[PDB]
Amino acid sequence: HATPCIKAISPSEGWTTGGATVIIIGDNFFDGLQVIFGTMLVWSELITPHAIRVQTPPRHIPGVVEVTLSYKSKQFCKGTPGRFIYTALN
Amino acid sequence: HATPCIKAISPSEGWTTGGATVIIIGDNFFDGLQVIFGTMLVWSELITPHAIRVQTPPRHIPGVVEVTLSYKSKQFCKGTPGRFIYTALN
Ligand code: EMC
Ligand code: EMC
Ligand code: EMC
Ligand code: EMC
């Protein structure tokens, strides 16, 4: 299908303080594609039609989150969500 | 420990004629790092310590290649190399 799809993300770990640049790669990306990162909608930008750059949001609490894709307030469910582990320095 | 390594490549397939923009994600990337497509070495452009950008070199014959990294004429090899598949239009 031509539905947006995440292959992998790097880095897949980051501090709770956030702000680190994450690259999401996969299939069928387009400008306007929204990225949802631990439930927060983040600013994003296509590097190519196969790569997206986002900054990690801050997160109150350490642990695994999902990275998913959405457009016009409607999420896509093709494939496997990106997985990102927040860690606390503290 | 601090060694450049490939997690994934997007897209992982290209035409034998080369020139395609490819994003490679991983860890420990830096300025001046080079990429080997089977036997062909190309330059990269750093995006973050976790992603680089290359243009695929042409390959005379279609097929699967191992993708590895290099710096100062010295190839790295940590973990599982990347896989890129050349396809012919003909
Ligand atoms: C299911 C391939 Hg991004
Ligand atoms: C978990 C359904 Hg997009
Ligand atoms: C530890 C292989 Hg990027
Ligand atoms: C041939 C695996 Hg460094």
**Ligand 3 center–CA B4 separation, angstroms:** 8
Token pair in block for residue B69? 């990294």
Cβ of B81: how many Cβ atoms within 10 Å? 16
Q: How many CA atoms lie within 13 A of A10 on its CB side?
A: 23
Q: Can you name the residues that pair with A41 across neighbouring β-strands?
A: A36
Cβ count near A32 (within 10 Å): 9
Angle, vertex CA B13, rays to CA A26 and CA A69, nearest 5? 10
Ligand 3 closest atom vs CA B7? 3
Q: How was this structure determined?
A: X-ray
Closest CA to B10 of B71, B72, B87, B83: B83
DSSP class of residue B57 equals P
Q: Which residues contact A13 (CB under 8 A, 6 or more apart)?
A: A84, A85, A86, A87
The resolution, in angstroms to one decimal, equals 2.3
Nearest CA to ligand 4 atom 3: B77
Q: In this structure, which amino acid lies at residue B43?
A: W
Give bridge partners of residue A5 from the DSSP assignment: A27
Strand intervals (E) in B11-81:
13-15, 21-27, 34-37, 40-43, 45-48, 51-55, 63-71, 74-75
Q: Which of residues 39-58 of B touch A (CB under 8 A)?
A: 47-48, 50-51, 53
Q: Sketch out chain B's domains with CATH numbers.
A: 1-90 (2.60.40.10)
Q: Are A69 and A3 in contact (CB under 8 A)?
A: no
DSSP secondary structure string for all residues of chain A: --S-EEEEEE--EEETT---EEEEEEES--TT-EEEETTEEE-EEEEETTEEEEEPPP-SS-EEEEEEEEETTEE--SS--EEEEEE---
A49 contacts A30 by C-beta, under 8 angstroms: yes
| C-alpha torsion sign, points B60, B64, B65, B67 | positive
Cβ under 8 Å to B: A residues 68-87:
none
| Six-digit token string for A72 | 């016009």
- CA nearest A55 in B: which residue? B48
Contact assessment for residue B9 and residue B23, using Cβ atoms and an 8 Å cutoff? yes
The shortest CB-CB distance from B21 to any of A7, A9, A48 is to A48
Q: Is the CB of A79 under 6 A from ligand 1?
A: yes
Q: Which atom of ligand 1 is nearest to the CA of A80?
A: 1
Q: Does A9 touch chain B (CB under 8 A)?
A: yes
Q: Which two tokens stand for residue B49?
A: 């310590």
**One-letter amino acid for residue B71 of the chain:** Y
- Type of residue numbered A41: L
Report the pocket of ligand 3 as residue ranges, CB < 6 Å: B 5, 7, 26-27, 78-79
Residue type at position B65:
V
> Nearest C-alpha of chain A: how many angstroms from B10?
6
Long-range contacts at B85-89 (CB < 8 A, ≥ 24 apart)? B85/B12, B85/B13, B85/B14, B86/B13, B86/B14, B86/B15, B86/B16, B86/B59, B86/B61, B86/B62, B87/B13, B87/B14, B87/B15, B87/B16, B87/B62, B88/B15, B88/B16, B88/B62, B89/B15, B89/B16, B89/B17
- In whole angstroms, what separates CA A59 from the centre of its chain? 14
Q: How far apart are CA A53 and CA A25, in angstroms?
A: 9
